Amino acid sequence: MTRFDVLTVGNAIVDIISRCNDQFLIDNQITKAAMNLIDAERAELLYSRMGPALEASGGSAGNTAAGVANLGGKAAYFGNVAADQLGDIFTHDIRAQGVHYQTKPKGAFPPTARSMIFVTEDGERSMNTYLGACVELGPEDVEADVVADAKVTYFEGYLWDPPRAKEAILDCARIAHQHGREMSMTLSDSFCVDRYRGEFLDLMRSGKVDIVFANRQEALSLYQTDDFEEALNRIAADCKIAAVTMSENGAVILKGRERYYVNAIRIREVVDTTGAGDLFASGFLYGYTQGRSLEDCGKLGCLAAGIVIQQIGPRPMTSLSEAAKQAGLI
Amino acid sequence: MTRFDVLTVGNAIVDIISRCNDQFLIDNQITKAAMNLIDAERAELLYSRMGPALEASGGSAGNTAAGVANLGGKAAYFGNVAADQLGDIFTHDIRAQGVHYQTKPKGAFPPTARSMIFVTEDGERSMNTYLGACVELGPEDVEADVVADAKVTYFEGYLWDPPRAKEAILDCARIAHQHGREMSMTLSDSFCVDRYRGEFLDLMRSGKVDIVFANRQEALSLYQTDDFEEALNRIAADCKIAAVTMSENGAVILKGRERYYVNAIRIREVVDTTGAGDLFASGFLYGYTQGRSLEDCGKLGCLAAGIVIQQIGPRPMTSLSEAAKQAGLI
Ligand SMILES: Nc1ncnc2c1ncn2[C@@H]1O[C@H](CO)[C@@H](O)[C@H]1O
Numbered sequence A, B: 001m002t003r004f005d006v007l008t009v010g011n012a013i014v015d016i017i018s019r020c021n022d023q024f025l026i027d028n029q030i031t032k033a034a035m036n037l038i039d040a041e042r043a044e045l046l047y048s049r050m051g052p053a054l055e056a057s058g059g060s061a062g063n064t065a066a067g068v069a070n071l072g073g074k075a076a077y078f079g080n081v082a083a084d085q086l087g088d089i090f091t092h093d094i095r096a097q098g099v100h101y102q103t104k105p106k107g108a109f110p111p112t113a114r115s116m117i118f119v120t121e122d123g124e125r126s127m128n129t130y131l132g133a134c135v136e137l138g139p140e141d142v143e144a145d146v147v148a149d150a151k152v153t154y155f156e157g158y159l160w161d162p163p164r165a166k167e168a169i170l171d172c173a174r175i176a177h178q179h180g181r182e183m184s185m186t187l188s189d190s191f192c193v194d195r196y197r198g199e200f201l202d203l204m205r206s207g208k209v210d211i212v213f214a215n216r217q218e219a220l221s222l223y224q225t226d227d228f229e230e231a232l233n234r235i236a237a238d239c240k241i242a243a244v245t246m247s248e249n250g251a252v253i254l255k256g257r258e259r260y261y262v263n264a265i266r267i268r269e270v271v272d273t274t275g276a277g278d279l280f281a282s283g284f285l286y287g288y289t290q291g292r293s294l295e296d297c298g299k300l301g302c303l304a305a306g307i308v309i310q311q312i313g314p315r316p317m318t319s320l321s322e323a324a325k326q327a328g329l330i
């Protein structure tokens, strides 16, 4: 028995969420469906144009850790906030879900990261993120005992944007593998993959990452191809296990020459896609650390992802364990 | 023409919202369906026990002003926040709705008011409010030109808790009535009525308040009676116009010997009752300042209230003007 099933590591962010029309994205030169990095001045400008909003704790890996805990797994999280009200919100929400979260703020400035997320009528989400205190996450924030005692340590490709987070991740990889654990990453966003393609492939090929999460766009971006079959063949050669999501078309899990396709749940209405990939990773990694088949891990991922897109906000407000039991995935 | 249809005045609050079981309220000695005032220490304690939450700008009168603006009316708001992140959220959300909001923060301490609102399975809401910077609202915050230029000035009974807000209200009443405008209040909460019964009746009987909003519980509390018919007869005698809501049983508008009964709208589900009364006041006052019949004012109020209870959070995220046009109230 170990202390943790899943440790996740990412940019600690509070989401500021509002609905907009498609013209808003065009007028403001916001790339639809993507993570758009912004500076403090641009954050002020976009906020001044944003309608009334709702706030909810976010951060891709934060959401994944919360989802693991929700399902009943034992989760931990590394991510840096500031000693401010937004940081206090973030700290409360993740700890209240039962995730181990002990990363200490380094003062009030830079302030806690926030992402202005604009949800269009089709339920797509377009994020505009000021990293703030996330730039301070570094090797000093690695709780070595936690990495050692976690079955899987999972991190965001998004961590390659701040300056020193990658150093923490390399430390995690060393500790995890020295203690016989596994490392996992998400490719996070197609433009993120554009930025760090070579680095990501090296993480996989050197064996620093064992399990990779991608959506279709990310997989295509990783190999700069329009051929999805090529992307699947290549990603399977580059990592031990790959979990590739395809929105309404479900998911495919690859291991060597093995492929396991999983159907997406049929949806009432797509309210807000924010968190879909994050919660797919929650379901998959919960199943994986419970010793479930790759197909069942995919099923658990699709169930969690389907639930989160039927609500506003990135962390399911309902019980995923109850949902999983009803679905016979238990 | 005037600059404003409705000026509202209230405790400026950010809501922190979570779902709980009925046992949680009992274990924590939270009075169900009520506004429970709390100190800083109790706020810390309750927060430590609360699950993951979402944040949304609140404040009863704030919500009412936002609803008037949503419907297409011209609204203003007086309420005091701190110079902190929660205050910045509050300031953003109300201004983004098109409400004039110019009250200046006085410092960072006390911090911006917040209310932990626990929603039970029946959709009832139980609020736990630390007033924070609201204790600083006073006569200095009265923008006399705004009061002079507003058709109706509406305020919360809740303002009788902080120490100096009542002085601002008395100043508002004077300026309003000297400029031929009307004053309105809501009784806010049955325990609030218990605390300030005599003062509230004095506001009405002296004519400082022209239009009074109450729910059934508040009306009964005002006259310490179990007889709803008595309460209606007495409230009609004590104020020029009374609007009394009765939840699923709609509302009754009273003027002198006149009575206008209005039905509740048909609804999908009671998700969260937070804001119901606030938005009834939005609909009513919007109608009133557009020169509509008292019955139509009631119908607009019931429409807005019915909309808000079908969503999480206190301010409608959909267009009230569009809904009013579709319902044929225009
Ligand atoms: N640069 C980023 N790094 C990590 N997570 C992010 C970033 N920008 C937005 N997010 C998060 O992505 C989540 C949706 O997957 C949101 O909850 C949001 O907080």
Ligand SMILES: Nc1ncnc2c1ncn2[C@@H]1O[C@H](CO)[C@@H](O)[C@H]1O
Pocket: B010, B011, B013, B014, B015, B035, B057, B058, B059, B060, B061, B063, B115, B127, B129, B156, B158, B159, B274, B275, B276, B277, B278, B314
């Ligand atoms: N003491 C108070 N004064 C004014 N508004 C309040 C108080 N406590 C809670 N509220 C607000 O009541 C609203 C619902 O009517 C919520 O949005 C919440 O912010």
